[PDB]
Ligand binder design. Structure first.
Ligand code: NA
Length: 396
């Protein structure tokens, strides 16, 4: 039976163009389905969606990030996709459960993850060789990493860290290497109860900065764009970033760059499969089955992914991930291979950012600067941070 399906997403023009081709491919294969696409840049997208939420007129397939996933989900606007994953509609046989965890709110699958990124240590291989150093990514520890950064400074005259900013990403990574977490599951306070974890993390940051193998805050504040960034300029041999950012860095840099598993990820599976973005279906949709079939095509059809080519992150299906590599250049292939390697020892996505998250972020950023400026001790800072952070979170 003929049907019209409304499909919405955000991005820039390249994404619009290949997404349109994917849609045309779907209509070519399924001529009973007629698709009306709505798209905009990020700013405009959410503005355009708000009045459709209002009138119960959301498109049948809508692209989401985790933050709006949580907002729409909490307002009961989104259809649980779980049954579609059981009843044959969305095939998840080549999609590990951990890939999809980022779309799960309150045990409901409100969004289907379209691609993932994973934290990495990205290295300039030429500068590793100039220093005569090497990274054994399997099992290296925080001490090994510290020693690496000193060797980089002493023997190659460059930094071994880009600064591990922002701290709201990398201190939580640290805590996970230690079998700990930053936020409580319920969002009401800090999970970790030992301030020594904070002290240990930031005492290391100080050592690195004091040893001149990580930037001082003023240096960090001068970096405007990616063409200024430390790895791009050869100022650091090391940059800490999600896997997708490697593409940007590699196109801008002369030197061969590689992605490495960060230190001490192994024992507690500290890395997570972070969703790039998700497709959701509103409860108001009159075509929820056809919307789910489109989502399935989008994630499992290999011909379609020959067009998408990992632009929305590394494909959640290991079959699709492997199938696109022949068409990807080396740098894009490196990203896929990295994530595939990381995914062998990895944890589910974190839960949704709790309310008050933006203030905690700023608090931790200001706290880090004061520590590196030595305006406050790491000991003292651990205490005031816990107190302020818990007061913010206690409000939710
Ligand atoms: Na390739």
């Amino acid at each position: 039976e003929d049907v019209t399906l409304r499909i919405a997403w955000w991005g820039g023009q390249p994404r619009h163009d290949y997404t349109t081709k994917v849609i045309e491919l779907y209509e070519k294969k399924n001529p009973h389905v007629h698709i009306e696409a709505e798209f905009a840049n990020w700013d405009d997208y959410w503005k355009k969606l708000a009045p459709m939420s209002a009138a119960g007129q959301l498109p049948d397939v809508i692209q989401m990030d985790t933050a709006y996933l949580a907002q729409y989900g909490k307002k009961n606007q989104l259809e649980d996709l779980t049954p579609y994953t059981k009843d044959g509609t969305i095939d998840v046989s080549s999609i590990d459960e951990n890939m999809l965890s980022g779309g799960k709110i309150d045990n409901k699958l409100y969004g289907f993850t379209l691609g993932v990124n994973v934290l990495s240590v990205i290295a300039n291989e030429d500068l590793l060789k100039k220093a005569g150093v090497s990274i054994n990514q399997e099992n290296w520890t925080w001490e090994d990493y510290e020693k690496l950064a000193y060797d980089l400074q002493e023997k190659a005259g460059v930094y071994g860290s880009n600064g591990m900013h922002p701290p709201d990403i990398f201190f939580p990574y640290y805590l996970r290497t230690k079998g700990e977490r930053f936020y409580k599951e319920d969002g009401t306070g800090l999970a970790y109860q030992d301030d020594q974890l904070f002290v240990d993390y930031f005492e290391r940051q100080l050592r690195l900065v004091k040893a001149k193998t990580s930037p001082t805050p003023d240096e960090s504040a001068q970096i405007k764009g990616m063409e200024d960034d430390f790895i791009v300029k050869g100022k650091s041999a090391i940059t800490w970033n999600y896997s997708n950012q490697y593409l940007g860095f590699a196109r801008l840099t002369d030197s061969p760059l590689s992605l490495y598993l960060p230190p001490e990820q192994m024992q507690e599976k500290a890395l997570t499969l972070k969703p790039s973005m998700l497709f959701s279906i509103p409860k108001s949709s009159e075509h929820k089955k056809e919307a789910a079939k489109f989502i399935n095509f989008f994630v499992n059809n290999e011909e379609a992914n020959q067009l998408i080519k990992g632009e929305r992150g590394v494909p959640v299906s290991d079959k699709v991930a492997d199938a696109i590599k022949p068409k990807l250049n080396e740098e894009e292939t490196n990203i896929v291979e990295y994530v595939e390697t990381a995914s062998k020892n990895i944890s589910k996505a974190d839960p949704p950012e709790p309310v008050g998250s933006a203030e905690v972020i700023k608090l931790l950023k200001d706290t880090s600067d004061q520590i590196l400026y030595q305006k406050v001790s790491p000991e003292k800072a651990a205490k005031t941070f816990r107190k302020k952070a818990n007061e913010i979170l206690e409000r939710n």
